[PDB]
Symmetry: D2
Subunit: 480 residues, 4 copies
C-alpha cells in the first residue's frame, strides 16, 4: 500500500495493492517460469527474461499513459477505477502464454490439435477468470471501488477484443481511447510493444529505434468519427514508422532467428513425441495431455517451461524419443539450416500448402551428381510472414494525428505525405529450409535440392547460392 | 609509450605517442572549440560535444578495424606503419571543419564565396599539412618508422581521395582495403560514420540500430576484381541497411531539425553581415575575412565557434546588424517555420533554382482574404536532399559479401535478395518554408501563401494543411 | 573456427572451438537452469539470469586479461595452450553450483549434511572431470595442443586451489600469475567478481563502482618475493577499494536482501522436508537424495532449480508439507522480518552458537504486556558475515603495485597512504530476526522479544526500535 | 503551454511557459558558454557539457520531488505557485557561475580579489535579479499566479540561504521542506547533486553510486522539532551514505584530478596576467576587469569561457605573457606533477597557510646529490579538502528518517546503527605538489625536495616515494 518494484527497464515501479494481490497468485507467478523469447535464449544467452517481468512492465506503462492523458485532459473524466482496470489488463494480457511462449501457440498446438483454434490471448482471458475466482479477488476489487461485473468485462475486452456500432460492453464510446492502450486492435500501437522493445534489446544486447516515453508526452485524445481516440502529434509520424521498423529489425534478428526457430521446432517435436505419455492433473483430479491442458486452467497453471526439463530427466522408455531430441539440443546437434528464399511477384504461400512444401523440395531434380538422395521427411520448411502487424495493410493509415495549431482537431496522414521512399506493400514472406540429416554429404545434397527448387519455383536467388550451388545457379537466366 | 584517454562512447582508448604528438597541437586542439552539431545544440542541450572528441573516436575505430583485419588475416601483411597511417587519417579527417561544422561549408561559404568551390575535407588536407610543417612532425614520423613522403600522401589520399588503373600513390592495390576504412568513397561505410552514430545518439538522447562492433567482427578482406576489399558477411546485409536507416533517422530528427536549421540560417546571416568588418590575422600578419580565412591555414587555426561570441559581445556599430540577429537567437525570437512539402513525380529542384523559390511563394495568390501582404524577402526556403549517401544510388549494390561456406570468395547481393519492402529509389527532397516576420497576422498569411504554392506546384499536401489552410486545401482535387 | 556469442554485458564474445565443445554438453548446459541470484529473483524481477551466461562472461574476461598480459609483456612467454586453460577454468568455475546457487551450499547442504564439508568449487572440479570423461574431450584437447594430464590439473587447480615450496603441479612458479586470474586465493580480486558485478547491476537495476576494463589496461606482471604476480598501477588503488565497496553495496542491497534471504530459507525448508522422499537416479541406476546427489555427478547433472517446480506440482502426500511452503511463497505468505541488529565491542558470534540463538530470543522477558507468547521454534535468526573477502584482513595489503617511473618494480601501499577515512576493520556481522507466525498480534510480540534481546545482549539498537518497541528502548541507558 | 526539451540524463522534460520565459534570456543562455567541469574537459574529452544543461536538469528534478510530495501528501497543501518557485530556484542556482565554473570562484577570485568574499551563489542571486528586471519577468510571474515580492525572496533564499526562530521570509515554517530541495543547507542532500552525479558520469564514462529516483519514491515529509522536513525511509540510510561515497569518488577521480587541477591553475595564471589589460563593458558603457566584472551584472553576462580564446587569439603585446601560458596548454607543456601527500595526526592546514607552503618545500634540504637547486617560485602547492560537505561533520546525523511501521513519526539514526565500518571523521586533506620547471633534471630535484619535505613535516609517505626518492625514504623510520 503501495509496493515498489525495481525494474531494470523502467526503474522503480509503484503498484497499487489491488494489483499486488493479483500478482501474488499461482496464476500470475506462473509467468516467472516461461521464457519471453523461448528458444531464443539458446541463441542469445542474455535473453533469460520471463513473461512475468514483461507483464509488470506492460502494466506499468499502461498506467503511465492513462495517467498522462488524465493530467493533460481532465475533461476526459478518467477515474482511478479506470486506471486500475487498464493496468490490470496490462498485467494480465500475457497470462495465457504457454511453455516457451509463441512456440506453444505458434507451433505446438497447431500440430498437436489442428481441429482446435487457440491463442494465448484466449488463454489469458480464461486464466484471468480462473485467477480471480480461485483467489477471491472480486471482494478486493469492490473494496477499492471497482465494480466486478462491468470491470472484469472491461479487462477481458482489452485483452481479447469484443467478446461476441460500438461493440464493447465494458465501457461506453466516450471511453474508447482506453481500449487503445493495452492491445490496440485498430493499429497495433500499444504499451505491450513498447516494453518488449526496450526489454528485449536490453537483454539481447541489441538497440531500439522507438522512443515510447516521447510518444506518451505528445499523445492526446481527440474526437474521431464520434469516438474519442488517442491521437499522435503530426510531427511524430516518422517516429511511428520507426517503431515498426524497430519491430521488424528485432523480428528478423532475434524472434525469427534461423537457429532459434530450429530449436523451437525441435522442442515442439519433443513435445509431440511426449504428448500422450505426459499427464497433468486438472480440476477434480482429471488428467490432461500437454495439448489438452489448455482446456482446464487448473492444469494449465502447472504447465510451463519446466516440462522441457521433466522430459529431459525422464527415465521412462515411452519418453525416450522425446528425451533424445532434447539431448541433441544440449549437445548442439541441431537440424541444419540450408537456405532462405523469397516468393516472387504477387505470389504468397497459403497455410494449407505448408504440409506439401517439404515434398516439393525433394521432388526437385538438380542437374548435378549426387552421392545421396534425400526424402521429403528429411526436409523442414518454415514459412515466416513479416509485416507491419496489419498483414498487407499500412498501420499508419489507421492512426489519427493532431497539429500544434489545432490540438482538438484530428487529421489523417497518408503515406505520400510522409515519404515517397516508404513501401507500397507492408508484408513479405521468408522461406527457410532445414535438413534433418546433418552429415556433410547430406548437407551438400540439400543445398542442391534447395537452390534447384528456388529456380523451379521462380523464388528469389539465395544470397549464398553462388557458393553453395555453383552448378545450379547458372541455369537460371534471371539470376544471371 | 601509450597514452590512455577515457571516452564515454568507447571507454579507454590507447594512443600511440606519435598520435599524441599530432593531437597536442594548435591545429588539432582547435577542434575542441567547434560544435559537432552546430546549431543543434540550441535545440538539443545534450549535443554539447565538439569535433575533437569525435576525431579521437574516429582514430580509435580506424585502429580497431585495421588491427582486427591484421589479427584475422596475417597474410594481408598489414604493418604498424600501416596502422598508424590509417589512425592519423582518422584523427585528421575532421581537421578542416569550420565554425558550427556543416553550417560553415554547407551554408556560409556558398553564400559568401559562390565563385569558390570548397569543402571541409579540402580544409582537412590543408590543415594537416600546416600541422605537420608548423610542429616538426616529420622527424617524429621517421623516428617511429614512417616514411613521410609515401605516408603523408597516403594520409591525404584517405581524407580527400586521389589527389588528381589504380589512382593512388600512397599504397599499392594489394593494400586497397586500407582506403576503405576512414572515408569510403565507394559506398560511404566507414568508421567516421560509426563513431558519430554512437556519439550523437549518446549526447542527443536518441537511439540507433547499427552495431559497428559486430561489423568489425565479421569483416574480412577478399579479392574483388583484382582488388583486395573489405567484405561484409552475407548475414550482416540487413544490418548494413539498418545503418543507413539509422543515418536517415538522425538526419531527419536532428541534423536537419527544422528549428536547428533555422538557427544555423540565422547564424549564417549574422556571419554574412559581419564578414567585411571582422579581421583575422594570418601568416605574415596578413588580414582575412571570415570568408577568406580558408585561404590561409594560420588564419583558419584561429577561426572557430568563438566568432559567434565575438560578434555577440562586440560594441562596434559596424557589427550592430550582425549582433542583433544573434541577440534574437538568445531571446528565442526566431524566424518562424511555416511548413514542409515534397516534390512529386519526376520533379527535382536544382541548386540554381534555390534563389528563385522565395519569390515563387510570394507570387502565389491564395484566394483567401488577407489582412497583410508578404514579400519574397520575407520568406526563407530551405531545400534538403535526403539519400543513402550515394544520391539516387543504392550503397549496398556497392558492397561485397562473403559466405560462411567459402570465406575467401566475394559475392554480390541485390536488393531483391534482401527484401521486397526496400525502396526503389534511395533519395528524396524536402522543402521547408520559414517566414521572417513573426507576428500572428503575418504567420497566418504565410501559411496561405505556402499551401497555395504547394497546390500550384503540384507538391505533396502539407500534413497540417487542413488545419493551417482550410480554405486553400479544398481547391486541389488531388488532395482528396 | 571461432563461434561468436552476443552478451549484453560484454557484447560479442569469441569462443575457441575447444571451448565450444566443452560448452555444448549436458554438464555445462545444466548451468542454464540455475538462477545466479537464487531467491533474489523473487525480490528483483530483473535478476532472471542464470549461471550459464555468467560463466561465459567469466571465461571471456579471463581470456581478456591473459591476452592483455601477453601483448603487454611477451617476455612472460604466455601460450595459446595457457590461454585456453585459463579460459576453461573461467567457464567451469561455476560448474559445481547447485539449485538456487549459494542457497544450496550456503544453507541447504550445511543443514542437511552437517558431517560433510562441501562447496560448489569442490563440485565444479568433480563436475569438470565428469564432463571431460563422459563427452570425450581429452582427444579434442590434444588436437588443439593441450596436454591433458598437465592441463586438467592446471584447470582444477585454478578452480579449487592446490589439490593437496611451490604447491601447484599444473604450472611452474614462472607462471604463477595465471593462478591469480580466475580465482584469486591471495586477494579475491579476479575475473569472476568483475563479470558478476557488471552482470548483476545490469539485471538488478543497481549501479557499479568498479571499472574492470580499466584495471586490465593498467595490469602488469612483476616479480614479488621470487614470484611473478599481477600488479596494479599505483593510481588504481582507489579503484580497488571501490571494487570492494561495490561488492559490499551489492551484498547488503541484493545478495543479503532481507526478504530474499527469507525466501531462500523457505526454499531450503521445503528441500529438507522433501529430501527423504525425492529420488534422483545416478550412475548405475543408483538412487540419491537431494542432499546426496553431490556424491554422484551423474545424479548431480539432473539436479537444478527444476526441483522447486517438481515439488510444487507434486501430488504425493509425503511431499505435502514441502509443497505447502512453496505454495506460501507463491501467495507471498512469507515468514516475517522483525529486525536487524549488530554485535558490539569485542563480540563475534560463533557458528556453534547459531542453533542456540532462536531459544535466546524466546527466553528474553520484555517489560510489556503480551497477549501471546512466542516459542523458540517460532523464531528464525540469520547471521551474516560481511567483509572484504579476507575476513578481518584488508585485501589491499595483499595487493602489489607498480609506478609509472619504474614499471617492473613492485611496491606495497598501506591503508594510511590511501586514506585516513578507510575502516579500521573490514568485517562486521549482521543479525536478522524473523518470525514464523505472521499474525499482527504475533508480530508485535516478536518485536518486543527482539528489542529486549538486543538490550540484554548489548547489541546495537535497531534503527526502527523507538517505533517498534517504544516501551523497551527507554530501559537501556546506552541507547538513550 | 508546456515546452518539451530532450535531455540525455532525464529524457523528455516538460517546462512551464513561465520557466521557458526565464530560460530564454541572455542571463540564462550565458550558461551555455560555461563548462561544467572547467579544465576537466582537457583531461576528459567527454566532459564537454555546460552549466546550462545541468541547470535544466536541476530544475526538472526539483519539480519531480516537489510534485511527488504533493501527490503523496496532499495535506501539505503544496501549490503550483510553490512548484514553480522551487523549479525557478533549481534553474537559477547556477546562474552565478563564472568562466570554467569552480576555477573562477575557487581559484581566480580569491587570488585576484582577496579582500572580497564571493561565491557563485552570491552571483546567482545578483544575476537572477538582473535577469528578472532586464527582461520584465515580474508581470509574467503575476500572470501565472506568483506574487513577485514574496516569491522572489523565496527563490533567492533557496539559492543562497537566509538573506540577513525561523529565519526565512519567503515561506512559513509549515513550508520548511521546500527549502531542502534545491540547496540543502543543513545536510547537503539536494537535487543539484543528483543531476550532476548522473550527468557527469554519463559524460565522463564513469558510473553512479546513488539512485536519486529511488530516493524520491521513499521521501516523506514529517514534523521534526516544530518544522516540516523531508524525511528519508530508514532502509535508505545505506544509500545515503553511498551518495556521499559516490561524490567522493567523483571528486578524487575527476573534479580534483591532478592534471585537471593543474590546467585550472594555468588558466587562472593566465587570467591574472591578463586581468589589467582586458576590458569588459558594463551597464552605461562602464569598463570592468575580469576580476571586477562580478560587480556589474551586465558586464558579467558577457563573461564566459570565451575569454580563454579571446586571450589566446590576442595580438596585443600586453597580453603576451597570458597568451603564452594558454599556448603551453595547447602544446601540452604543463607544469609537472611531483607528488601527493597527507597530513598526519591532528594536523590540519589553514587557508592562510597556503602562501607559505611553496617556500617551505624549497627550504627542505634533502642532502642527496643534486645537479640543480630549486626555488620557492618554482613550486606550486595545492591543498584540497575532501569531506562529506559538512567539513568534519557527518551529514547523516543531520538527516531525518521514518519507519514503515509509523510513517508520520520522524527518527534519528546514529552512525553505529548503520555500520561499525564507517569512519569516525568525515574530512581529510590532500596535498599536491607541482614543479613549474619541466626539465628532467629539475623534476628529479623536485621529487627529492618533496619527499624530504614530507619526511620533515611528518606527512604520509608518498605512494611512489620508494621509486622517486629511494635515498630519502630510508631516513624516516616511521615509513620503514
Ligand atoms: N536499485 C535498488 N533496488 C533495490 C534496493 N533495495 C531493494 N531494491 C529493489 C528490490 C525490489 O524489487 C524493490 C523494492 O525493494 P525494497 O527492499 O525497497 O522492499 P522491501 O519490501 O524489502 O522493504 P519494506 O517492505 O518497505 O520494508 O527495490 C537498492 O538499494 N537499490
Ligand atoms: N547484437 C546482435 N546480436 C545478434 C544479431 N544476430 C545474431 N546475434 C547474436 C545471437 C548469437 O549470440 C550471436 C551470433 O549469432 P549469428 O546469427 O551471428 O550466428 P549463427 O551461428 O546463427 O550464424 P553463422 O553460423 O555465423 O551462419 O550474435 C544481431 O543482428 N545483433
Ligand atoms: N543465491 C545467492 N547468491 C549469492 C549469495 N551471495 C552471493 N551470491 C552471488 C553473487 C554473485 O552473483 C555470485 C558469486 O558466486 P561465485 O561462486 O561465482 O563467487 P564467490 O562465491 O567467490 O562470491 P564473491 O567472489 O564473494 O562475490 O554469487 C547468496 O546468499 N545467495
Ligand atoms: N529523442 C528524440 N528527441 C527529439 C526528436 N525530435 C526532437 N527531439 C528533441 C529536441 C528537443 O530537445 C525536444 C523537442 O523538439 P521538437 O522538434 O519535438 O519540438 P519543436 O518545438 O521543434 O516542435 P513544435 O514547435 O512542438 O512543433 O526533443 C526525436 O525524434 N527523438
Ligand atoms: Mg599521463
Ligand atoms: Mg554458427
Ligand atoms: Mg516548439
Ligand atoms: Mg551541492
Amino acid at each position: 500500500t503501495m509496493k515498489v518494484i525495481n525494474d531494470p527497464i523502467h526503474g522503480h515501479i509503484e503498484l497499487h495493492p489491488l494489483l499486488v494481490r493479483i500478482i501474488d497468485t499461482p496464476q500470475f507467478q506462473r509467468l516467472r517460469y516461461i521464457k519471453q523469447l523461448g528458444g531464443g535464449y539458446y541463441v542469445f544467452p542474455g535473453a533469460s527474461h520471463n513473461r512475468f517481468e514483461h507483464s509488470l512492465g506492460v502494466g506499468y506503462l499502461a498506467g503511465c499513459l492513462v495517467h498522462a492523458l488524465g493530467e493533460k485532459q481532465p475533461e476526459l473524466q478518467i477515474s482511478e477505477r479506470d486506471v486500475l482496470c487498464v493496468q490490470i489488463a496490462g498485467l494480465c494480457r500475457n497470462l495465457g502464454h504457454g511453455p516457451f511462449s509463441h512456440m506453444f501457440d505458434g507451433r505446438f498446438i497447431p500440430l498437436a490439435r489442428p481441429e482446435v483454434k487457440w491463442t494465448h490471448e484466449q488463454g489469458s482471458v480464461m486464466m484471468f477468470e480462473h485467477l480471480i475466482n480461485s483467489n477471491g479477488i472480486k471482494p478486493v476489487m469492490e473494496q477499492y471501488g471497482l465494480i466486478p461485473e462491468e470491470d472484469i468485462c472491461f479487462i477481458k475486452e482489452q485483452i481479447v477484443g469484443p467478446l461476441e456500432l460500438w461493440p464493447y460492453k465494458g465501457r461506453p464510446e466516450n471511453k474508447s481511447f482506453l481500449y487503445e492502450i493495452v492491445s490496440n486492435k485498430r493499429n497495433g500501437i500499444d504499451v505491450d510493444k513498447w516494453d518488449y522493445f526496450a526489454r528485449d534489446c536490453h537483454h539481447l544486447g541489441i538497440q531500439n529505434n522507438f522512443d515510447y516515453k516521447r510518444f506518451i508526452k505528445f499523445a492526446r485524445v481527440c474526437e474521431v468519427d464520434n469516438e474519442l481516440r488517442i491521437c499522435a502529434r503530426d510531427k511524430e509520424v516518422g517516429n511511428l514508422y520507426d517503431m515498426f521498423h524497430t519491430r521488424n529489425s528485432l523480428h528478423r534478428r532475434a524472434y525469427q532467428h534461423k537457429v532459434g526457430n530450429i530449436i523451437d521446432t525441435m522442442i515442439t517435436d519433443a513435445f509431440l513425441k511426449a504428448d500422450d505419455y505426459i499427464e497433468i492433473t486438472g480440476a477434480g483430479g482429471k488428467k490432461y495431455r500437454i495439448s489438452t491442458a489448455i482446456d482446464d486452467m487448473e492444469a494449465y497453471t502447472k504447465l510451463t517451461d519446466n516440462i522441457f526439463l521433466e522430459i529431459l530427466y525422464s527415465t521412462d522408455p515411452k519418453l525416450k524419443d522425446a528425451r533424445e531430441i532434447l539431448k541433441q539440443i544440449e549437445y548442439r546437434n541441431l537440424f541444419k539450416y540450408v537456405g532462405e528464399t523469397q516468393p516472387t511477384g504477387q505470389i504468397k504461400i497459403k497455410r494449407e500448402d505448408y504440409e506439401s512444401l517439404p515434398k516439393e523440395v525433394a521432388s526437385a531434380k538438380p542437374k548435378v551428381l549426387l552421392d545421396v538422395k534425400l526424402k521429403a521427411e528429411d526436409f523442414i520448411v518454415d514459412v515466416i510472414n513479416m509485416d507491419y502487424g496489419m498483414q498487407e495493410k499500412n498501420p499508419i493509415d489507421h492512426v489519427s494525428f493532431y497539429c500544434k495549431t489545432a490540438p482538438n482537431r484530428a487529421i489523417r496522414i497518408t503515406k505520400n505525405q510522409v515519404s515517397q521512399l516508404l513501401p507500397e506493400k507492408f508484408a513479405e514472406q521468408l522461406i527457410r529450409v532445414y535438413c534433418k540429416k546433418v552429415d556433410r554429404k547430406s548437407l551438400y545434397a540439400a543445398r542442391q535440392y534447395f537452390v534447384q527448387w528456388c529456380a523451379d519455383r521462380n523464388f528469389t536467388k539465395p544470397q549464398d547460392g553462388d557458393v553453395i550451388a555453383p552448378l545450379i545457379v547458372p541455369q537460371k537466366k534471371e539470376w544471371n
